[PDB]
Design a protein around this ligand. Structure first.
Ligand SMILES: [Zn+2]
Ligand SMILES: [Zn+2]
Ligand SMILES: [Zn+2]
Ligand SMILES: [Zn+2]
Ligand SMILES: [Zn+2]
Lengths: 98, 167, 252, 48, 48, 48, 64, 44, 134, 98
């Protein structure tokens, strides 16, 4: 999200350069049912309530560089040989050691 | 090379002087002192400058900085200049506020100099003060405490007639 | 403070951390400069309330993904207002929301009062009142909002193309210049311009959609759009690819 | 905004700023070893 | 050299500035040492 | 060049140390500081 | 990244033979036969072409 | 003060007060253009 | 065992080969500097300071920096050189500029300016230094 | 053949192509010296400033080595004169200084 509030896809190279966190918004469907004791219950469903952001491992199924051909990666300034498998937190490539 | 002076002043009554001149002449080494008549000015742009003419020597000007021990010392750079300086400093932009001629006699020493004189105000010479003034101006590059100490001994010799201190 | 040099500026040194007279080289101070720092190479009630306000500000900012710089400006504004204490009678939550709005305005990415209310439990009326009081207390001012301020966010949330966003921005700016919408709120004018551009482009958005994102009633959008509709060809950019011709734009 | 006598940053106790000298021993930051102060306790206090 | 009564704290020594020198951070914001903060605490409590 | 050894000036080495001082810190071998009998330190590069 | 101008060992000009070497490989020459045709007799020179990796070709795929 | 957009490679003048952003691209990563001052390299 | 200079896990290298680029390398070092307007009146701004405007500065020359306080690419930088000129307003403005490693002596490779995750302006400067085997 | 003289080397050398690697450890990044450099605030002891001139730690093992050597003057120099020399005025009657 830019300072003006306009969302835009975040490329991993952009995250690395701008010290951003490669994270994906997370939404939950939440059903709230209120029983007033008046013999009627009101059920309202909030669709896709934002609950936070999850850092995304690069080259995973949920990364922007998923299923992209080597030419597309080159156009995005990403090494096709780069295996991914790490997270970009504040622009720092973090790898989770097993 | 720049030198800062050691000077400190005092005044002497008229009747007193007749004893002082003989006192100073005998005490220090010299022959037949000279009466020095000079016409001094002061120039302000703050950078107070003093240009002195003496009645065929060239116009000698001197600057004294702000004072920096038993002595009064301020950085001084004295430079001899040829004639037609006054108009030169007019084209500089300096302005002359007052000018006074000084009359009297000066006696020397190994390094230090004694000059006894009275300040004359100009309009036409008038005696600003009835008593002369005496100082012990000493010029020495890279001033050190040793030079100032020697003045203390000499001043103590002259203490009885006139007691002088820096101001 | 070179002893032989009255009023001498001593140059700092990084090799030894000392200040040295430049004209003689005398070392005044041995290791006095501390090059390591010089060269960069039980809680009180008031403080607890301030901390709670900061936490609320961070929550509200993250709700709409506001940057940490705006958050910090909001924190500073809240500190100033809270210590000034002219708003001590007002809720800390309302003060925080108004400070967040003022911080957005000062940073040049204003959010509508409705947008701030959507993330704050405080109502729009209370937020506006606290905003006025905060402006008076700070003796400062905020630049008047313009239609172009909200175009980026509104178009991005509506997922409109960049060309459509440019067309909407140009339409709103030209309408304001021509004075076709006197007194109308900038948000309403921007919503009407966005509706015009969307209807003239392939990506068509309903009045309800635009009102939902912009915080403006479809009726208000209708009024503004009706005011700008007669001169739509004049308002539209010259090099705009009209999927729907300007003549055939919806009339309402 | 200036050192005050009887305060924690007492100028007597030593040098405050690097380009300064304390009033007690007239020594700069490097030369001055620092001088102790004292606090009178209205009630005697145990030593841990 | 050591009297038992001296073990009780009646006058509290105050370390010189050199022991607990004031630090500068974020410009000219003088960051007083932990010793300075504690000495402020004892000073306030003693005055009270 | 960074490291230095303080040699005491003697008539035996007066000329050699004078030459080293003249060379100064700029060109190795040279000197970095001169300490007078007063104990004061003079920076050669600052004062050429 | 790019073929060295000179053989590191003996200094023979080797920077003008990369394109010809690739052309021979396309023309179905074995690597040794292509090196012999190019005239690289010393194994020090043959190593230059045999072990070279032309990363510049892929580096050019990124827009300037 | 000329800056090159990191996406579209467009030069644009930018002052010390205005925000750093491409004039037409909208891209927020900028690269300073190479200095006019000429640097000498020994071909060693 | 040619001359004994390769003894005890040591190596003798061909100077001519090294001259011909043998095992020659680049060392890229990236410096990141952010300007933060955090504080009541404590703001940081990228700009080339002046020896008199700021509360205090250094003998290091600031001529390398540009009007924006950033060193342009292609400029040789050695020790005691300012690559980023920052000023933090005093609660004058104190000099908050950043220097390089004294040993390091390279050329400014790439200077980029952007907004970090916090929205504050910051610059990343990549300095390139050529390491010939020695 | 010997390069200096051109004479055949009596033993026949084993020479051939081998794959070598240049490690990141360069002497340029490791060389550092300290000679009358900056010191910290409280300890008045050496600390690296604007360079790699933080000095070297004269540890307990080095202290014991110099003790075994018997170089008392050098040990005193290293621990006192080189690190943080200092002098204080102390009263003879009462040991506490003033
Ligand atoms: Zn000096
Ligand atoms: Zn003291
Ligand atoms: Zn070869
Ligand atoms: Zn662009
Ligand atoms: Zn005693």
């Amino acid at each position: 999200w830019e300072r003006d509030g306009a969302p835009s896809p975040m490329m991993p190279n952009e995250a690395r350069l701008r010290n951003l966190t490669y994270s994906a918004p997370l939404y939950v469907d939440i059903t709230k049912t209120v029983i007033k004791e008046g013999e009627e219950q009101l059920q309202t469903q909030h669709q896709k309530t934002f609950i936070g952001k999850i850092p995304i491992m690069l080259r995973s199924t949920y990364c922007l560089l998923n299923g992209l051909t080597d030419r597309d990666l080159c156009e995005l300034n990403e090494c096709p040989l780069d295996p991914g498998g790490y997270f970009i937190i504040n622009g720092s490539e973090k790898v989770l050691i097993a | 090379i720049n030198m800062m002076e050691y000077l400190l002043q005092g005044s002497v009554l008229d009747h007193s002087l007749e004893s002082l001149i003989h006192r100073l002449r005998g005490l220090c080494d010299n022959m037949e002192p000279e009466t020095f008549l000079d016409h001094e000015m002061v120039f302000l742009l703050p950078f107070v400058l003093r240009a002195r003419r003496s009645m065929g020597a060239p116009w000698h000007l001197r600057y004294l900085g702000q004072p920096e021990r038993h002595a009064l010392v301020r950085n001084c750079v004295d430079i001899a200049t040829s004639e037609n300086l006054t108009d030169f400093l007019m084209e500089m932009g300096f302005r002359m506020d007052h000018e006074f001629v000084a009359k009297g006699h000066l006696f020397r020493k190994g390094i230090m100099k004694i000059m006894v004189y009275k300040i004359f105000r100009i309009l036409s010479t008038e005696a600003l003060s009835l008593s002369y003034l005496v100082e012990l101006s000493v010029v020495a590059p890279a001033g050190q405490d040793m030079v100032s100490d020697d003045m203390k001994n000499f001043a103590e010799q002259l203490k009885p007639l006139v007691h002088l201190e820096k101001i | 403070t070179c002893p032989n040099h009255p009023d001498a500026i001593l140059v700092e040194d990084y090799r030894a951390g000392d200040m040295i007279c430049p004209e003689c080289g005398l070392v005044v101070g041995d290791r006095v400069i501390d090059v390591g720092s010089e060269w960069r190479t039980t809680m009180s009630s008031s403080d607890r309330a301030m901390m709670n306000a900061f936490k609320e500000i961070t929550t509200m900012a993250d709700r709409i993904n506001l940057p940490r710089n705006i958050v910090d400006r909001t924190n500073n504004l809240f500190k100033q207002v809270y210590e000034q204490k002219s708003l001590k009678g007002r809720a800390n939550d309302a003060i925080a929301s108004a400070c967040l709005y003022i911080a957005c305005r000062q940073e040049g990415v204003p959010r509508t009062f409705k947008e701030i209310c959507a993330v704050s439990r405080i109502s729009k009326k209370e937020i506006g009142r606290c905003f006025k009081l905060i402006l008076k207390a700070l003796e400062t001012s905020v630049d008047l909002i313009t239609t172009g301020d909200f175009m980026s966010r509104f178009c991005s949330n509506l997922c409109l193309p960049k060309q459509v966003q440019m067309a909407a921005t140009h339409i709103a700016r030209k309408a304001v210049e021509l004075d076709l919408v006197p007194g109308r709120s900038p948000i309403s004018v921007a919503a009407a311009a966005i509706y015009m551009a969307s209807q003239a482009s392939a990506e068509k958005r309903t009045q309800k959609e635009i009102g939902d994102i912009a915080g403006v009633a479809d009726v208000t959008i209708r009024q503004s759009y009706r005011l700008i509709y007669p001169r739509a060809p004049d308002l539209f950019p010259t090099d705009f690819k009209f999927d729907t011709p300007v003549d055939k734009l919806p009339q309402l | 905004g200036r050192p005050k006598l009887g305060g924690l940053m007492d100028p007597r106790q030593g040098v405050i700023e690097r380009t300064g000298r304390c009033q007690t021993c007239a020594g700069n930051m490097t030369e001055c070893p620092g001088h102790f102060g004292h606090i009178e306790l209205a009630k005697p206090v145990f030593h841990v | 050299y050591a009297r038992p009564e001296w073990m009780i704290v009646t006058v509290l020594p105050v370390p010189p500035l050199s022991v607990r020198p004031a630090v500068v951070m974020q410009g000219s914001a003088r960051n007083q040492d932990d010793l300075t903060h504690k000495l402020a605490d004892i000073v306030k409590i003693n005055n009270q | 060049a960074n490291m230095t050894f303080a040699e005491i000036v003697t008539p035996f080495n007066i000329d050699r140390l004078q030459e080293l001082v003249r060379r100064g810190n700029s060109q190795y071998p040279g000197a970095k500081y001169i300490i007078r009998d007063n104990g004061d330190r003079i920076d050669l590069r600052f004062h050429p | 990244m790019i073929i060295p101008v000179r053989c590191f060992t003996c200094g023979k000009i080797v920077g003008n033979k990369w394109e010809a070497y690739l052309g021979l490989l396309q023309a179905e020459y074995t690597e040794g036969d292509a090196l012999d045709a190019l005239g690289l007799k010393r194994y020090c020179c043959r190593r230059m072409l045999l072990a070279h990796v032309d990363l510049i070709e892929k580096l050019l795929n990124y827009a300037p | 003060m000329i800056y090159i957009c990191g996406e579209c490679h467009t030069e644009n003048e930018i002052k010390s007060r205005d925000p750093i952003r491409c004039r037409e691209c909208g891209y927020r990563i900028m690269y300073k253009k190479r200095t006019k001052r000429l640097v000498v390299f020994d071909a060693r | 065992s040619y001359t004994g200079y390769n003894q005890e896990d040591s190596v003798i290298m061909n100077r001519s080969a090294v001259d011909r680029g043998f095992f020659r390398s680049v060392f890229y070092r990236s410096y990141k500097e952010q300007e933060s307007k955090k504080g009541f009146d404590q703001e940081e701004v990228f700009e080339k300071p002046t020896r008199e405007t700021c509360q205090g500065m250094r003998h290091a020359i600031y001529d390398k920096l540009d009007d924006d306080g950033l060193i342009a690419p292609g400029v040789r930088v050695s020790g005691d050189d300012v690559i980023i000129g920052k000023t933090v307003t005093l609660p004058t403005k104190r000099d908050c500029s950043t220097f390089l490693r004294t040993s390091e002596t390279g050329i400014v490779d790439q200077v980029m300016v952007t907004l970090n995750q916090e929205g504050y302006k910051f610059c990343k400067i990549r300095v390139r230094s050529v390491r010939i085997p020695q | 053949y010997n390069g200096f003289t051109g004479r055949k080397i009596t033993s026949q050398i084993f020479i051939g192509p081998t794959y070598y690697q240049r490690l990141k450890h360069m002497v340029d990044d490791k060389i550092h010296s300290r000679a009358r450099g900056p010191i910290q605030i409280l300890n008045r002891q050496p600390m690296e400033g604007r360079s790699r001139d933080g000095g070297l730690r004269f540890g307990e093992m080095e202290r014991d080595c110099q003790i075994a050597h018997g170089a008392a003057q050098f040990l005193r120099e290293r621990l006192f004169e080189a690190s943080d020399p200092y002098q204080v005025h102390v009263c003879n009657l009462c040991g506490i200084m003033a």
